[PDB]
């Protein structure tokens, strides 16, 4: 006789019939039985021992929920609300939000707490957190129209006072509440309905989750999953624009395409699938080829090989750029593709001078001047960059090692 | 009812081991599949975790004692271990994890 029961012993058969009529939703029996019963009691007596309102909301009966919500003696009403938001029933949620005691905000002690203690959904979760947690758009919209905004996670390192108070004797549930609210702000429903524009808040919150993934050693997988969900929200939002006006509002926002820092910020924060999209790739090619369209439409990379072979000769382009700017070749020489073909080509003639120096004074001086040009290019490169940023790339090291060995 | 014992002949177990044979092992692994499931484990006893561990190692022993049906005893013991893991996973407070 070790079995556990919610009620000590099954008591009333009449109240048990009331519960069996509230479970399967027999409205006339509970309507006729509302008035003529001795008292309307919280029945429980189940495996989970839910109330009649709770048991009726679990199964979606709107008429018996409306009938019970007028009894005024009910309990667990808030717990029934979090349950109905979990199940995703909109009619029941709006019928409960108009109940008494729910005027103004009730959101954000002795509330919910079904069966005398030990409520569900972690006891730190308010209605809106569970609403955006389940991706319920209508319910999130109704709760936001009533003015329930999610609280901020606060800060990880900041002790403050109440955060330090809840860090001792409450511990290990503090991180659970942190990642719970963070799962709250990170979902498409709250991101789209909450703010003025989604994309800015989504990017900023994405890099913040990326920082708090590394700051906290535990739960790093989960923070990774939330940040990735956010990045996918942004990618999915840019994917849905069918016109150039909308793609320019998503990419740039408020000399080609001036004031483009948002893509710069997107590659700074390492959003992978935002910059790889076909629309964004089309934009960046439009800025990448720029003044020269003829090669943008060119047939094969072999024509680009002949183009890099004809760009190999310095004297024409260098003499032009030095003596006069802003010619036709002056407008062309300023461009994203031309600096690339010229830089790469001159690298190839450096290799060629290496091979011809090896096969059999002048080659010496030329190669020396070339590695001096490389070390000056690394002067201008390391100028703008802090020692840590310069050393971030493994290859950015090996390059300096190469030119240094040449100097030695 | 309990599975009784594999090696013990007793009287009624020996009576059902002859002329009833090959259905005796079927009844054994059938009842063992009975005690091994989350419903009976959670509702049956005072605490689930102790009975689940003890029954898990007992199924691990009877997997090696009996050469046949070793795969199925392995599956039942693994189902039990997963019941315990799933039960420890659901505690949201330090008091409950302790």
């Amino acid at each position: 006789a070790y079995m556990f029961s919610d009620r000590s012993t099954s008591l009333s058969i009449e109240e048990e019939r009331f519960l069996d009529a509230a479970e399967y939703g027999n409205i006339p029996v509970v309507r006729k039985m509302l008035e003529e019963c001795h008292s309307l009691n919280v029945n429980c007596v189940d495996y989970m021992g839910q109330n009649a309102l709770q048991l009726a909301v679990a199964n979606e009966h709107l008429e018996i929920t409306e009938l019970l919500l007028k009894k005024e003696n009910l309990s667990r009403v808030g717990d029934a609300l979090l349950l109905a938001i979990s199940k995703g029933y909109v009619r029941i949620v709006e019928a409960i939000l108009s109940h008494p005691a729910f005027a103004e905000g009730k959101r954000l002690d002795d509330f919910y707490a079904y069966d005398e203690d030990g409520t569900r959904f972690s006891h730190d979760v308010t209605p809106i957190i569970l609403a955006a947690h389940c991706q319920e758009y209508e319910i999130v919209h109704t709760l936001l129209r009533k003015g329930a905004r999610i609280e901020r996670p606060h800060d990880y390192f900041c002790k403050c006072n109440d955060c330090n108070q809840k860090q001792k004797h409450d511990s290990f549930s503090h991180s659970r509440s942190r990642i719970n609210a963070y799962k709250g702000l990170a979902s498409p429903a709250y991101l789209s309905l909450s703010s003025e524009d989604p994309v800015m808040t989504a990017l900023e919150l994405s890099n913040e989750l990326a920082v708090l993934a590394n700051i906290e050693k535990e739960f790093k997988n989960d923070y990774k999953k939330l940040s990735m969900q956010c990045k996918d929200f942004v990618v999915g939002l840019l994917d849905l624009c069918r016109n150039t006006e909308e793609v320019e509002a998503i990419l740039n926002g408020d000399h080609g395409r001036p004031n483009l820092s948002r893509l710069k910020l997107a590659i700074k924060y390492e959003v992978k699938k935002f910059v790889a999209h076909p629309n964004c790739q089309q934009q960046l090619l439009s800025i990448w080829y720029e003044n020269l369209s003829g090669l943008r439409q060119q047939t094969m990379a072999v024509k680009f090989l002949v183009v890099l072979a004809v760009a190999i000769g310095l004297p024409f382009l260098a003499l032009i750029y030095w003596f006069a700017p802003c010619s036709k070749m002056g407008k062309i020489m300023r461009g994203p593709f031309m600096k690339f073909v010229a830089h790469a080509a001159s690298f190839t003639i450096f290799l060629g001078l290496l091979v011809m120096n090896a096969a059999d004074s002048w080659m010496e001086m030329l190669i020396i001047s070339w590695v001096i040009g490389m070390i000056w290019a690394e002067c201008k490169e390391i100028w703008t960059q802090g020692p840590k940023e310069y050393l971030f790339e493994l290859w950015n090291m090996l390059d300096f090692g190469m030119l240094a060995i040449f100097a030695a | 009812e309990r599975p009784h014992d594999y090696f013990c002949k007793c009287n009624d177990c020996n009576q059902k081991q002859k002329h009833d044979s090959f259905s005796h092992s079927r009844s054994r692994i059938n009842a063992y599949k009975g005690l091994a499931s989350p419903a009976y484990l959670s509702l049956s006893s005072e605490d689930p975790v102790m009975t689940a561990l003890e029954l898990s190692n007992e199924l691990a022993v009877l997997a090696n004692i009996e050469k046949e049906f070793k795969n199925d005893y392995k599956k039942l013991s693994m189902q039990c271990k997963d019941f315990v893991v799933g039960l420890l996973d659901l505690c949201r407070n330090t008091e409950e994890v302790e």
């Binding site: 556990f4 495996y47 989970m48 203690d117 030990g118 | 989350p38 509702l43 505690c91 008091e95 409950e96």
Partner: peptide, 30 residues
């Protein structure tokens, strides 16, 4: 005592969670 109460809370959570997990999986033509 406290231990028994905690066991009741854990068993209740596990039963309800198990019924939700049963709900979440597909359909039966029957």
């Amino acid at each position: 005592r406290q231990y028994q109460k905690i066991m009741k809370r854990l068993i209740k959570r596990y039963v309800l969670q198990a019924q939700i997990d049963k709900e979440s999986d597909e359909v039966n033509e029957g």
